[PDB]
């Protein structure tokens, strides 16, 4: 049941990334605390957001409710293992202990991993470790648990749950700058309709496109977005980035820049991207310019400055620092405003890699085969 | 080393350094920057002025020469700054058209100085130069026009196959 707790993770990100109205973080943390016993939101807001303007006792009462809850959980721990349970005593205690403080976590994972017995004992354990990680912007939890899973969960698994583990892997692959294996693991589209792991299938589409407009080269672009009309029956609900992708074939750079600003702000205000979203947009820029110049040579940026908006000075500094970033072999001027189609690998590079590696590894093995004697 | 502090210490280093700067050395400059480094940035204008002066010389200004010559006698660095004028002018003899299109009378007047002696005329009649019509060119092609890359590398193939022979 991590979808609402994924929304709570987004609450924590709102507490983290936007410090505009810290009461809004206090707002939804108190809203998640007044019911569902969720006190961890309340300590979380106490720390980063406001210091709980009025929640000294209004949430300490529900903290005492969580205290009685945890104490009766740990009492039924012995009341039920009094009876025989096929690791199901510890299974129930780990499930119910995955609400209040990290007390619930330490009575959750210290009582499952020791007697995790079958696929489900770790199926839910790894799903909910992914959730306890995703509440913050974690990667140790949400993939170390996948390591345990590889040791524990699947072993054949389901045609349903294993696709879910793979979609977890892809969900972090888009959370991190792993701009391909997300869409690879999000290539299912027949096994992630709706789940307690899918906070929103439309948000599934968001994470998917925010890795597919990069992983999917033009053939894979049309393969998954266009051809794969399975996601289209659902991405019919978010036409902004969809039409962006539509232009992403005809290469309409004006609307490219419109939606580029749009998605830039969007990522600026979206989870698990705050300290990294910098490249994606300028990467889209350079990649599109690549094909645009690849059209032909005797062309101008000014002829494209229209598509660039008023992009003469914009792209001046832009492509200056981009070629300075060592990108996109091409030619362009100011007094001449050139465009180019160049950089064939089978000119020298397809022959330069030869020594690039047969000297790197050559001397690697050389010194490696030097200390064999000296 | 525990001697009374030397009077002309500050500018004997400067005499040596400006002589070095005149004779165009490449590493004794840096062993000079290593033997006494701590008195170079804080003080010692006889050294502090030549080292940042060298930064300005290989920064791109032969006019900081004259800005500086505003005040550098410095007890008879006059001969050495005359040799510094000489290393201005023969480095102009090199760097006047290294890979330039063409200059005219006025860029001679800017980069060179002393508007027209028989010395820039001596340049035009001493380096193998065409004094064009109020105009300059290195030559008619500037590069002496820079057709068999095959047979020398065929001899290379001879000794190359030879060295691949006698070994296994």
């Amino acid at each position: 049941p991590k979808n609402p707790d994924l929304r709570i993770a987004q609450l924590r990100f709102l507490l983290s990334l936007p410090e505009h109205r810290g009461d809004a973080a206090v707002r939804d943390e108190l809203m998640a605390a007044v019911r569902d016993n969720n006190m961890a939101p309340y300590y979380e807001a106490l720390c980063k957001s406001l210091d709980w303007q009025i929640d000294v006792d209004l949430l300490n009462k529900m903290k005492k409710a969580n205290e009685d809850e945890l104490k009766r959980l740990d009492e039924e721990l012995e009341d039920a293992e009094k009876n025989l349970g096929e690791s199901e005593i510890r299974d129930a205690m780990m499930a119910k202990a995955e609400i209040g403080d990290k007390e619930g976590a330490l009575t959750a994972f210290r009582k499952t991993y020791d007697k995790t017995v079958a696929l489900g004992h770790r199926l839910d354990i790894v799903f909910y470790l992914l959730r306890i990680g995703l509440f913050y912007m974690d990667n140790d939890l949400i993939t170390r648990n996948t390591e345990k899973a590889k040791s524990l969960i699947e072993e054949g698994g389901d045609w349903d749950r294993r696709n879910r583990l793979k979609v977890y892997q892809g969900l972090y692959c888009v959370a991190i700058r792993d701009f391909k294996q997300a869409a690879e693991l999000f290539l299912d589209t027949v096994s992630t309709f709706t789940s307690y792991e899918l906070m929103d299938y439309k948000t599934f589409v968001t994470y998917t496109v925010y890795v597919s407009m990069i992983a999917l080269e033009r053939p894979d672009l049309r393969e998954k977005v266009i051809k794969g009309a399975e996601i289209l029956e659902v991405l019919h609900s978010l036409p902004a980035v969809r039409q962006y992708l539509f232009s992403l074939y005809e290469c309409r750079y004006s609307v490219f820049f419109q939606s580029l600003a749009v998605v830039e702000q969007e990522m600026k205000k979206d989870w698990l991207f705050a300290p990294h979203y910098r490249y994606y947009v300028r990467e889209m820029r350079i990649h599109a310019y690549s094909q645009l110049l690849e059209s032909y040579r005797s062309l101008t940026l000014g002829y494209m400055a229209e598509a660039f908006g008023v992009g003469v000075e914009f792209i001046d500094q832009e492509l200056s620092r981009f070629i300075a970033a060592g990108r996109l072999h091409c030619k362009i001027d100011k007094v001449n405003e050139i465009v180019e189609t160049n950089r064939p690998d089978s000119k020298n590079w397809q022959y330069q890699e030869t020594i690039k590696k047969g000297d790197l590894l050559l001397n690697r093995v050389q010194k490696l085969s030097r200390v064999i004697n000296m | 080393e525990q001697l009374p502090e030397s009077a002309y210490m500050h500018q004997l280093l400067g005499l040596n350094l400006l002589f070095l700067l005149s004779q165009n050395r490449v590493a004794e400059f840096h062993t000079e920057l290593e033997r006494l480094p701590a008195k170079d940035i804080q003080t010692n204008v006889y050294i502090k002025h030549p080292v940042s002066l060298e930064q300005y010389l290989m920064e791109g200004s032969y006019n900081k020469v004259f800005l500086a010559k505003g005040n550098i006698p410095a007890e008879s660095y006059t001969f050495f700054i005359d040799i510094l004028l000489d290393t201005i002018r023969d480095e102009i003899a090199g760097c006047i058209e290294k890979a330039y299109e063409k200059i005219l009378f006025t860029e001679a007047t800017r980069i060179l100085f002393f508007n027209t002696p028989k010395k820039m005329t001596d340049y035009a009649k001493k380096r193998g130069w065409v004094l064009g019509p109020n105009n300059y060119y290195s030559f008619a092609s500037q590069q002496q026009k820079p057709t068999i890359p095959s047979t020398e590398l065929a001899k290379q193939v001879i000794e190359y196959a030879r060295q691949l022979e006698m070994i296994v």
Partner: protein
């Protein structure tokens, strides 16, 4: 052109398009990729070496 439907260079500075494509080089592609795989194999053998050493 972007989808290999056309292979060549157009023009607006001269308004004159020119077509060209001669991709296939089995020598470079084939041999170079085989050598890449050879590099991977040598990387593999490096550990046999480092093991039998110590």
């Amino acid at each position: 052109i972007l989808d290999k439907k056309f292979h060549g260079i157009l023009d607006q500075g001269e308004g004159v398009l020119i077509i060209f494509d001669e991709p296939p080089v089995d020598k470079t592609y084939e041999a170079a990729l085989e050598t890449i795989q050879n590099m991977s194999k040598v990387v593999d053998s490096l550990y046999n070496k480092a093991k039998k050493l110590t």
